Amino acid sequence: HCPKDWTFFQGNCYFMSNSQRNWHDSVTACQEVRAQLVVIKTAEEQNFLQLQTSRSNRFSWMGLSDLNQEGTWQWVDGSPLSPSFQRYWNSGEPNNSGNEDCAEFSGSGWNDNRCDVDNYWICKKPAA
Amino acid sequence: HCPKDWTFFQGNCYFMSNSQRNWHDSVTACQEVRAQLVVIKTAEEQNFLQLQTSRSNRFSWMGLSDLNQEGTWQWVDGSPLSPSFQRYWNSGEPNNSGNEDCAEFSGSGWNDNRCDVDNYWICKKPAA
Numbered sequence: 524h525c526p527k528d529w530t531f532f533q534g535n536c537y538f539m540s541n542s543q544r545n546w547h548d549s550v551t552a553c554q555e556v557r558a559q560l561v562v563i564k565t566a567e568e569q570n571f572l573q574l575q576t577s578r579s580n581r582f583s584w585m586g587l588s589d590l591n592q593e594g595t596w597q598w599v600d601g602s603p604l605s606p607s608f609q610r611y612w613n614s615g616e617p618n619n620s621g622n623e624d625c626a627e628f629s630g631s632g633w634n635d636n637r638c639d640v641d642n643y644w645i646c647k648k649p650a651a
Numbered sequence: 652h653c654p655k656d657w658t659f660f661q662g663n664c665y666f667m668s669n670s671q672r673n674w675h676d677s678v679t680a681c682q683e684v685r686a687q688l689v690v691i692k693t694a695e696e697q698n699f700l701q702l703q704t705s706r707s708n709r710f711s712w713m714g715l716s717d718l719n720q721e722g723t724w725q726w727v728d729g730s731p732l733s734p735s736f737q738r739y740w741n742s743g744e745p746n747n748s749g750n751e752d753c754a755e756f757s758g759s760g761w762n763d764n765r766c767d768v769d770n771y772w773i774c775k776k777p778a779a
């Protein structure tokens with residue numbers, strides 16, 4: 524199914540880092556291994572990731588930013604965060620407190636955080 | 652079937668500017684017409700635009716910057732510049748010479764340039 528250190532879930536493989544980096548450097552680390560800082564396509568996928576991050580008690584980068592235009596959120600695959608999936612924001616988020624343009628998993632939902640924060644991160648590539 | 656003043660190429664509509672503007676202004680100019688400073692998704696698309704600029708010998712903006720993090724380039728739709736498409740930098744580039752954070756068509760490939768420079772620009776939007 525997937526490489527070692529990677530986890531299969533519904534057709535894709537997921538790598539949970541063992542180190543921390545800013546968002547930009549996390550984007551590239553995923554590219555280094557033919558993967559992408561995770562883009563969420565389905566409810567179940569979010570659910571799964573939300574829980575996996577909660578279990579290890581970690582904040583983790585996903586591939587979602589409003590770096591280009593404040594308030595218009597974008598997947599790293601160049602798609603808009605759809606109205607539907609805006610529901611995954613933690614309450615009161617995204618709040619852009621002191622310019623926060625990179626999404627992290629923060630307990631049960633998403634938080635916009637400073638891009639220069641060192642977080643864990645998640646790569647996704649297909650099982651195939 | 653694009654609107655008048657737009658050029659159709661493989662599903663999309665491209666607007667090649669007569670006027671020169673700086674990068675940020677070029678981003679807004681494209682938004683104003685329901686489009687986006689050009690994000691290059693395929694190799695063919697790259698070729699068409701490379702041709703279209705080079706035949707006039709003009710520099711032109713595309714929707715790509717490393718403003719938010721030196722060395723980690725990102726398209727204006729959210730997508731990071733992939734390792735594969737890094738092949739399109741002219742040789743020696745990006746050099747970030749006296750700081751350069753926006754990307755332009757520059758002959759046969761791409762050059763990083765100061766964002767305040769007035770350059771032509773290209774919009775893109777779906778033809779439906």
Ligand SMILES: OC[C@H]1O[C@H](OCCCl)[C@@H](n2cc(CN=C3NCCN3)nn2)[C@@H](O)[C@@H]1O
Nearest residue numbers: 582616618620623629634635636640641642
């Ligand atoms: O939780 C509410 C707000 O708390 C902090 O801001 C306080 C002033 Cl409003 C920020 N914040 C949250 C976090 C949690 N994430 C991490 N990652 C590394 C350690 N903490 N950090 N700052 C911010 O993103 C958030 O909207």
Ligand SMILES: OC[C@H]1O[C@H](OCCCl)[C@@H](n2cc(CN=C3NCCN3)nn2)[C@@H](O)[C@@H]1O
Nearest residue numbers: 710744746748751757762763764768769770
């Ligand atoms: O060696 C080519 C380098 O030439 C200039 O730097 C000189 C000192 Cl290193 C820069 N440069 C090139 C250009 C051409 N682009 C335009 N746009 C409108 C007119 N010039 N501009 N700066 C730079 O981007 C480039 O890497």
Ligand SMILES: [Ca+2]
Nearest residue numbers: 593622623624
């Ligand atoms: Ca911002």
Ligand SMILES: [Ca+2]
Nearest residue numbers: 589619623624
């Ligand atoms: Ca923001």
Ligand SMILES: [Ca+2]
Nearest residue numbers: 618619623635
């Ligand atoms: Ca926040």
Ligand SMILES: [Ca+2]
Nearest residue numbers: 721750751752
């Ligand atoms: Ca810079």
Ligand SMILES: [Ca+2]
Nearest residue numbers: 717747751752
């Ligand atoms: Ca730069």
Ligand SMILES: [Ca+2]
Nearest residue numbers: 746762763764
């Ligand atoms: Ca340059």
Ligand SMILES: [Cl-]
Nearest residue numbers: 667668669670
């Ligand atoms: Cl024009």
Ligand SMILES: [Cl-]
Nearest residue numbers: 708709710771
């Ligand atoms: Cl020119």
